[PDB]
Design a protein around this ligand. Structure first.
Ligand SMILES: CCCCCCCCCCCCCCCCCC(=O)OC[C@H](COP(=O)([O-])OCC(O)COP(=O)([O-])OC[C@@H](COC(=O)CCCCCCCCCCCCCCCCC)OC(=O)CCCCCCCCCCCCCCCCC)OC(=O)CCCCCCCCCCCCCCCCC
Ligand code: BCL
Ligand SMILES: CC[C@H]1c2cc3[nH]c4c(c3C)C(=O)[C@H](C(=O)OC)c4c3nc(cc4[nH]c(cc(n2)[C@@H]1C)c(C(C)=O)c4C)[C@@H](C)[C@@H]3CCC(=O)OC/C=C(\C)CCC[C@H](C)CCC[C@H](C)CCCC(C)C
Ligand SMILES: CCCCCC/C=C\CCCCCCCCCC(=O)O[C@H](COC(=O)CCCCCCCCCCCCCCC)COP(=O)(O)OC[C@@H](O)CO
Ligand SMILES: CCCCCCCCCCCCCCCCCCCC(=O)O[C@H](COC(=O)CCCCCCCCCCCCCC)COP(=O)(O)OCCN
Ligand SMILES: COC(C)(C)C/C=C/C(C)=C/C=C/C(C)=C/C=C/C(C)=C/C=C/C=C(C)/C=C/C=C(\C)CC/C=C(\C)CCC=C(C)C
Ligand SMILES: COC(C)(C)C/C=C/C(C)=C/C=C/C(C)=C/C=C/C(C)=C/C=C/C=C(C)/C=C/C=C(\C)CC/C=C(\C)CCC=C(C)C
Ligand SMILES: COC(C)(C)C/C=C/C(C)=C/C=C/C(C)=C/C=C/C(C)=C/C=C/C=C(C)/C=C/C=C(\C)CC/C=C(\C)CCC=C(C)C
Ligand SMILES: COC(C)(C)C/C=C/C(C)=C/C=C/C(C)=C/C=C/C(C)=C/C=C/C=C(C)/C=C/C=C(\C)CC/C=C(\C)CCC=C(C)C
Ligand SMILES: COC(C)(C)C/C=C/C(C)=C/C=C/C(C)=C/C=C/C(C)=C/C=C\C=C(C)\C=C\C=C(/C)CC/C=C(\C)CCC=C(C)C
Ligand SMILES: CCCCCCCCCCCCO[C@@H]1O[C@H](CO)[C@@H](O[C@H]2O[C@H](CO)[C@@H](O)[C@H](O)[C@H]2O)[C@H](O)[C@H]1O
Ligand SMILES: CCCCCCCCCCCCO[C@@H]1O[C@H](CO)[C@@H](O[C@H]2O[C@H](CO)[C@@H](O)[C@H](O)[C@H]2O)[C@H](O)[C@H]1O
Ligand SMILES: CCCCCCCCCCCC[N+](C)(C)[O-]
Ligand SMILES: [Fe+3]
Lengths: 281, 248, 43, 306, 54, 13, 53, 54, 54, 54, 54, 43, 42, 43, 43
């Protein structure tokens, strides 16, 4: 029921709202006020998705889809069978994510640690809201937001990207991809380095962080450090998501053309705009 | 172009995806079991083994060999909190908070909790003390930022609690670890760098009030700190966030 | 005044030699401008 | 108003750290480079020393030849015009030979041979760097986790440039060397094979790239939140569990219902990261060689309405 | 007027020299590029037209 | 750097 | 007057560097705008006068 | 005029020498490439014309 | 070349030998690939045309 | 050609031998692949045409 | 002319030699490639056209 | 005496066996090249 | 000085740097004259 | 001088056989170029 | 002085051998350029 060290930490306090009414644990989970909120929102959303599966006439989990209302419904409600179930699932998911972050804040306060984790999750929630709320609001239709299906929100990504040509040419998209790839690379390097220090070759003494720094200075001539690597991982992930949200917020609202054409401003700079040869000239 | 299916729609892509589902199930099992080398077996709130231990069995023990003759650690092994936890349960049934019996910050429970670590200093790859005062740290100096030597230290109650007299440094990582603060009583305390807010004119400590820097645990040797001592100091300072709230 | 640890005399001689260099650079540039303007004036 | 531990507020510098001389030939190791205060605001300020052995110099010179070959081809495409070179820098491309040459090496330099030369240089550079990571791990007596994690990415790279072109029967299938060029190649690869979104292994690879972002955010945030307890010194927390490890474990235990240890979270990390390129290489290998229309395959396997 | 030397006290002379040199070279390259851009002063095209080299 | 962060060259140099 | 008090708050060095960057950007922009207008491109005007193109 | 040697008391000789070597080689290549890109000064094409090699 | 023995006084012999091997191998492969690229010197293609092969 | 043993006075035989083995296998596979790619020397194709297996 | 030996007093011989080797090889490769790209000096194509090899 | 710390006798015996292996491999290579030249020459 | 080099060291360094520079500029002007007689750009 | 810490006699006994290997390699390369030029000249 | 930790005698010898190598390299370059020019002039 508890870890071998857990008991000395399960003290009252740290609650944002309430204090005794919802200050306890169910199994391993801490149940706050936001715990109750999150559980209700999640259960309502999941069973609504099951209901929409019943309405759609398919019991394939991969084929289940909850489309938003068509474009002619604007920013208004829709019949449950047509577009309203998506809106209820959307408000449920938004509430679930926000209450999950708040429950994390309560857990942080009880444990006496920093609030970095809910902050990063807030970045993720903001990207989600950009995709479901902010961008469709600026484009005046819930139909622009993605459907809630496993293989049908991919169709949303495909259609939305191809509306603007090759979506690779969105510059903020390029930056966000660079951050994502760099973050995966850094995660692999960090896991590998820690495991290699903690698991030396064969019956060898466990390595110190000096060995980690020496390994990476030998390899690439720099070592960001034990604290620096965790700072870097957090910042890479958050910057990736930030530039993802930035790239989507400007698409369809500030930019409407093919994204490749955006690069013409570099090739048309007057000093070299009309020099023959190369590719564009 | 392959694409012949052996049955139904089962081509090489189907074989690969089902093979990956099997591999992923095995890998998730492996990862979860490898992450059960600490904190298990599960215990009741009275410390006895619980009836429910979970779907995943405990892994085979493995032994780490410590780098400076410091010993050998086998996990999972026997687990016992080698300290008198000062808490009493507020409910007969499980899953409820345990209230402190006395001063939680003093007793070291909740956000003020510390762990009975080894009472030896952390040793770098050369076997020397990893964390040592800047005075004993040869050739070590502040390179950037405001050098906080002689800055007044303000608590969460907004009153001066002492003056910084030294910076304790991690030698190989070459980063600041602790500020040594001399209080109004002439005695010294250590404060983690992560819990101080160096500013233009003062070092601010939001965690502690002015009438709490005396309660910070001390170090037996004034030129070194052991894992247990820094665990106690950091636990105390962090617990100040919850337990010094009444003051501010 | 500080910010570098320099002095009056060191800064003054540094500036004097720097200004001599600036004067020489300007002389060469003006000679070039004069030659270009004679070759093909822009005014 | 509180210190978030994102940037160090006071930098400290001592004597240059030469590192651990387990089995390292100190002759190959260079001298310690400069100290960067700009880098010191975020991590370590020290640059170097860097080890330069047989594999190091082999990989460095081979990669220099690859980079220089691509650059000289780009200069040729610019007509030796520096203004054109800067204007069209992202538009230049060293393209693989046309499909009619198949896997043959008898393609002209302007039409694929120079691509083969640069590809050989890149192949040598990358494999020598892999051996270099393995040997640097071995010299310090550490485990080889970095080498195998690198091997996963090497496998995706090899599938993209070497293995799938051979299976498909032509070098024209491989990726051109160019900034916008390989983006065009990626988009065209998706279009030719019918919406690579419906490749299951592309989907899993994206699951694991998203999961790597999620997990590194979680882990970095967790370690920063317990850095006030010396939590970033993860090896000592593995060897002697402090209150940082317990508080991190209990945070995720009370949030998710399960947690990791200071050592096993890095197993989660390394596997989440390597599965990206492992699954991706499997998917790219399947594309064209087994399935040429992933949307139709999807429809036949659920995943899409008929 | 004769007291300008004291600026060397406030500013780091090394960085001042480096940044000034970079600015001077960039400015000169920019001006030479303006001259190359204009057909009226592109001395290469001018010489080619004068000596009928195309 | 964040204190002078309220283009980028002003904080840069 | 009493304007020298402005040096009691802002760092002189960053003020001077920002002023230099601002002045250079403004001068470049003004000259470029003069070039953009065909009636003030002194190279074009001189070409028209001396029958150069 | 004959007192410029004090410049060597400001910058490390190695740094200025490597920086100026890089600058000079880059400038030489830049100018040679500009000459190659202009067809009126591409000495290879000029020799091809003057010797009917194409 | 009776004074060229002093290189081994400043350069470790292992480094020199590995550098030589790497350079020669890469150069040889580059030149062979260049020859295979040129249809005038692709010896496999030349022999294929000479002996009425495919 | 006799005083060559002194390499082993400076080169570790283990590293030399693994490098030689990897180099030999890679070179052999590369040449075999080059022959297979060229339709003239694709011995499976040569056999299929010679013995009329298509 | 003769007082240039002092450069070896101010620069590390080993690093200078490595940089010199890299620079000279890159320059040689770049020039050979430029000559190859220009049809007037592509000695392989010139020999092919001279000997009717295509 | 050397970086690897090998005696001249051990270096000599190693060189002998290594060169023997080299000659054996080269002999098989020459046999193969002659056979393939006979079957289908490239010259 | 920042580098710490004394007056004589700066003297010798500058006198050899200029010695090299003059040779470089003389070779440069010889090359420029060769090109100009070959193909003037004015 | 003395960067690697070796003796001039060692430098001699090393550089001599280095030149031996270089001349062997160059001789084989010259023979190869001669054979190629005879077979199919490139000038 | 002595950034590389070398002596004037050692530096002089090093410069002499380096210049000998440089002059040999330049001589072979001159021969190659002459051969190319008589094969195909580029002016
Ligand atoms: C394949 C070639 C082998 C590479 C790995 C060799 C190895 O054993 O490394 C040990 C390696 C280093 O060991 P060491 O340093 O010698 O040991 C030091 C100490 O002894 C301490 O070492 P340690 O104890 O820390 O290391 C132990 C580690 C070492 O274990 C491994 O490395 C296993 C490697 C698994 C490769 C999986 C291939 C993908 C299959 C997907 C399905 C295909 C469809 O154990 C595990 O990680 C177990 C992982 C779970 C394995 C079982 C999963 C369930 C199986 C499903 C059936 C049963 C249900 O340990 C690790 O680093 C593990 C993490 C990194 C794994 C990287 C995997 C890379 C895969 C190759 C790249 C792609 C190539 C082409 C693949 C695509 C073809 C279709
Ligand atoms: C229109 C484009 C298509 C598409 C076409 C493709 C194609 C084609 C591919 C992917 C691949 C991937 N796609 Mg996709 N993809 C699409 C849409 C997406 C979307 C999205 C939200 O829309 C996302 C998140 C992704 C994400 C992904 C990744 C999960 C995966 C790349 C893994 C990787 O890290 O490779 C990057 C890592 C490597 C390539 C390996 C690098 C290792 C080597 C050794 C690096 C050496 C460095 C080199 C020597 C230079 C050295 C530099 C100096 C030393 C500094 N795709 C759409 C549908 N996608 C790849 C894949 O895995 O397929 C399943 C792939 O091939
Ligand atoms: C910002 C950096 C990255 C990041 C960070 C991050 N994510 C986080 C956290 C952090 C720091 C947490 O602390 C939190 C957590 O608890 O992790 C275990 C979390 C988390 N990130 C998660 C997932 C997740 N993160 C993603 C992305 C990212 N997370 C970023 C890349 C993705 C992507 C890219 O797809 C996913 C799927 C969860 C595991 C967890 C948050 C759990 C949560 O919010 O719990 C409450 C809600 C539920 C239990 C479910 C509610 C269900 C709804 C009611 C119905 C369904 C609605 C939904 C819209 C349907 C979707 C349909 C199709 C689109 C599939
Ligand atoms: C495949 C290439 C085969 C090369 C065979 C060379 C001749 C055999 C000699 C030999 O026996 O090669 C052995 C292994 O080499 C090796 O796999 C060398 C492997 C080179 C990389 C090729 C395999 C990489 C992974 C590819 C996976 C597919 C030598 O091991 P040791 O020196 O005891 O190791 C000590 C440590 O360095 C760890 O290795
Ligand atoms: C690298 C690959 C990474 C892939 C990541 C994405 C795929 C999902 C991975 C889920 C891993 C779950 C591991 C076990 C967790 C678990 O079941 O814990 C229980 C709570 O379950 C839960 O809360 C269930 C987990 C959440 C839902 C997952 C769907 C509490 O029990 P315990 O596992 O702590 O017990 C251990 C024995 N006592
Ligand atoms: C499209 O239409 C447009 C936009 C073009 C029209 C709009 C025009 C606008 C908006 C123009 C705005 C113009 C402005 C704001 C101009 C401001 C100009 C300023 C502030 C100029 C100031 C210059 C100051 C100078 C040149 C000072 C130089 C000082 C020295 C060289 C002495 C150096 C000494 C120093 C730096 C410190 C002294 C200390 C010691 C110890 C010596
Ligand atoms: C695309 O370009 C193409 C491929 C068309 C053309 C390019 C061609 C190129 C660049 C070809 C390069 C060819 C080269 C460099 C070939 C070199 C080959 C060599 C040197 C092979 C050497 C083989 C040596 C062998 C097989 C020796 C084996 C020795 C043994 C089996 C004996 C083992 C002895 C031991 C272990 C000594 C132990 C003794 C003691 C006392 C401990
Ligand atoms: C794109 O441009 C193309 C490629 C078309 C044309 C460009 C071509 C270029 C740039 C070519 C550059 C060519 C160069 C720089 C060639 C230089 C070649 C040299 C210096 C080769 C030296 C070779 C030395 C060799 C092969 C030595 C071999 C030695 C042995 C096989 C045994 C040695 C063992 C010894 C000496 C034992 C010594 C050890 C002790 C302890 C005494
Ligand atoms: C796009 O533009 C193009 C490329 C078309 C035209 C542009 C061309 C340009 C910019 C060309 C630039 C050319 C330059 C700057 C060439 C410079 C070449 C140099 C400086 C070559 C020098 C070579 C020196 C050599 C080969 C010396 C070798 C000496 C040795 C091997 C001696 C060994 C040294 C020893 C033994 C020292 C040991 C002494 C002691 C006491 C231990
Ligand atoms: C001023 O600029 C200079 C000239 C000084 C330098 C500038 C250089 C420049 C502009 C460099 C630009 C480089 C770029 C744009 C590089 C882009 C590279 C990219 C995006 C590569 C992307 C993918 C590459 C892949 C996937 C390569 C895969 C290759 C392999 C897996 C190995 C291939 C090996 C093969 C095909 C067989 C080779 C073997 C033989 C015998 C030919
Ligand atoms: C999730 C991991 C566990 C998977 C199950 C454990 C066994 C692992 C190997 C299973 C391989 C066979 O898996 C089985 O293949 C056949 C091949 O047509 C699939 O196909 C079958 O169902 C599908 C979907 O209704 C039909 O379109 C198809 O015509 C029919 O043949 C099955 O849907 C799948 O379940
Ligand atoms: C590392 C892998 C090494 C093994 C590679 C195995 C494949 C060898 C080369 C591929 C086979 C080439 O097969 C040949 O292709 C040409 C087109 O170029 C075609 O020619 C008709 C035929 O398809 C075939 O004669
Ligand atoms: C720079 C790259 C130069 C390649 C030159 C190849 C010339 C090919 N061809 C057939 C035209 O001679
Ligand atoms: Fe970590």
């Amino acid at each position: 029921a508890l870890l071998s060290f857990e008991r000395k930490y399960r003290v009252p306090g740290g609650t944002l709202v309430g204090g005794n009414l919802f200050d306890f644990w169910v199994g391993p989970f801490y149940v706050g006020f936001f715990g109750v909120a999150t559980f209700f929102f999640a259960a309502l959303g999941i069973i609504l998705i099951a209901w929409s599966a019943v309405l759609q006439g398919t019991w394939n989990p991969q084929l289940i889809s909850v489309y938003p209302p068509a474009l002619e419904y604007g920013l208004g409600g829709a019949p449950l069978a047509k577009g309203g179930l998506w809106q209820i699932i959307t408000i449920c998911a938004t509430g679930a994510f926000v209450s999950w972050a708040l429950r994390e804040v309560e857990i942080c306060r009880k444990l006496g640690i920093g609030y970095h984790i809910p902050f990063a999750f807030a970045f993720a929630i903001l990207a989600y809201l950009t995709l479901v709320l902010f961008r469709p609001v600026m484009m005046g239709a819930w139909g622009y937001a993605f459907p809630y299906g496993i293989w049908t929100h991919l169709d949303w990504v495909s259609n939305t990207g191809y509306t603007y040509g090759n979506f690779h040419y969105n510059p903020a998209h390029m930056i966000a991809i660079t951050f994502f790839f760099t973050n995966a690379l850094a995660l692999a390097l960090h896991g590998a380095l820690v495991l290699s220090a903690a698991n030396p070759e064969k019956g060898k003494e466990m390595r110190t962080p000096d060995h980690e720094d020496t390994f990476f200075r030998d390899l690439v001539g720099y070592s960001i450090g034990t604290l620096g690597i965790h700072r870097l991982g957090l910042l890479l992930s958050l910057s990736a998501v930030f530039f993802s949200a930035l790239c989507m917020i400007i698409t369809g609202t500030i930019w409407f053309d093919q994204w490749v054409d955006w690069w013409q401003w570099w090739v048309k700079l007057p000093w070299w705009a009309n020099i023959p040869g190369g590719i564009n000239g | 172009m392959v694409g012949v299916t052996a049955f139904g729609n089962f081509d090489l892509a189907s074989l690969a995806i089902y093979s990956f589902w099997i591999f992923l199930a095995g890998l998730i099992y492996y990862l979860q079991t490898e992450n059960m080398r600490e904190g298990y077996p599960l215990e009741n709130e009275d410390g006895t083994p619980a009836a429910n231990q979970g779907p995943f069995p405990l892994p085979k023990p493995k032994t780490f060999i410590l780098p400076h003759g410091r010993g050998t650690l086998t996990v999972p092994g026997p687990e016992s909190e080698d300290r008198p936890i000062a808490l009493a349960r507020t409910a007969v049934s499980e899953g409820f908070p345990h209230a402190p019996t006395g001063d939680p910050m003093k007793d070291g429970v909740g956000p003020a909790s510390w762990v009975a670590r080894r009472d030896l200093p952390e040793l770098d790859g050369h076997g020397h003390n990893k964390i040592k005062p800047m005075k004993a740290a040869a050739g070590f100096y502040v390179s950037a930022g405001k050098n906080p030597i002689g800055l007044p230290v303000r608590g969460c109650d907004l009153e001066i609690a002492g003056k910084v007299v030294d910076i304790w440094v991690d030698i190989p990582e070459q980063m600041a670890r602790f500020l040594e603060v001399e209080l109004k009583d002439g005695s010294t305390r250590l404060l983690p760098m992560q819990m101080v807010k160096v500013q233009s004119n003062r070092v601010h400590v939001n965690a502690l009030s002015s009438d709490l820097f005396a309660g910070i645990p001390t170090i037996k040797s004034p030129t070194e700190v052991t894992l247990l001592e820094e665990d106690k100091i950091c636990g105390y300072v962090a617990g100040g966030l919850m337990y010094a709230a009444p003051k501010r | 005044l500080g910010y570098t640890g320099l002095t009056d005399e060191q800064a003054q001689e540094l500036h004097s030699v720097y200004m001599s260099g600036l004067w020489l650079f300007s002389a060469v540039a003006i000679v070039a401008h004069l030659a270009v303007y004679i070759w093909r004036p822009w005014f | 108003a509180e210190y978030q531990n994102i940037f160090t507020q006071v930098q400290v510098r001592g004597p240059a750290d030469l590192g651990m001389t387990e089995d390292v030939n100190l002759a190959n190791r260079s001298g310690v480079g400069p100290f960067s205060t700009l880098l010191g605001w975020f991590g370590n300020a020290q640059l170097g020393p860097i080890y330069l052995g047989s594999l190091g110099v082999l990989s460095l010179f081979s990669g220099l030849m690859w980079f220089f070959t691509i650059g000289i081809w780009f200069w040729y495409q610019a007509g030796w015009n520096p203004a054109v070179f800067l204007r069209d820098l992202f538009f230049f491309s060293l393209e693989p030979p046309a499909p009619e040459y198949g896997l043959s090496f008898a393609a002209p330099l302007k039409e694929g041979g120079l691509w083969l030369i640069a590809s050989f240089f890149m192949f040598v550079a990358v494999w020598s760097w892999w051996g270099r990571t393995y040997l640097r791990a071995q010299a310090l007596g550490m485990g080889k986790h970095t080498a195998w994690a690198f091997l996963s990415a090497i496998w995706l790279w090899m599938v993209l440039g070497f293995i799938r072109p051979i299976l498909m029967g032509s070098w024209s299938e491989a990726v051109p060397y160019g900034i916008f060029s390989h983006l065009d190649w990626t988009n065209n690869f998706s279009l030719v094979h019918g919406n690579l979104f419906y490749n299951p292994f592309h989907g899993l690879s994206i699951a694991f790239l998203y999961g790597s972002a999620l997990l590194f955010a979680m882990h970095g945030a967790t370690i920063l939140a317990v850095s006030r307890f010396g939590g970033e010194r993860e090896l000592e927390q593995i060897a002697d569990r402090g209150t940082a490890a317990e508080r991190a474990a209990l945070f995720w235990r009370w949030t998710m219902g399960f947690n990791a240890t200071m050592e096993g979270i890095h197993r989660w990390a390394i596997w989440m990261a390597v599965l990206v390129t492992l699954t991706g290489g499997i998917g790219i290998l399947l594309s064209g060689t087994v399935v040429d229309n992933w949307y139709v395959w999807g429809q036949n396997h659920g995943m899409a309405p008929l | 007027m004769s007291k300008f030397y004291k600026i060397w006290m406030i500013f780091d002379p090394r960085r001042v020299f480096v940044a000034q040199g970079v600015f001077l070279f960039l400015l000169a390259v920019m001006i030479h590029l303006i001259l190359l851009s204009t057909p009226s002063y592109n001395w290469l095209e001018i010489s080619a037209a004068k000596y009928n080299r195309v | 750097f964040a204190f002078r962060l309220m283009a980028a060259f002003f904080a840069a140099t």
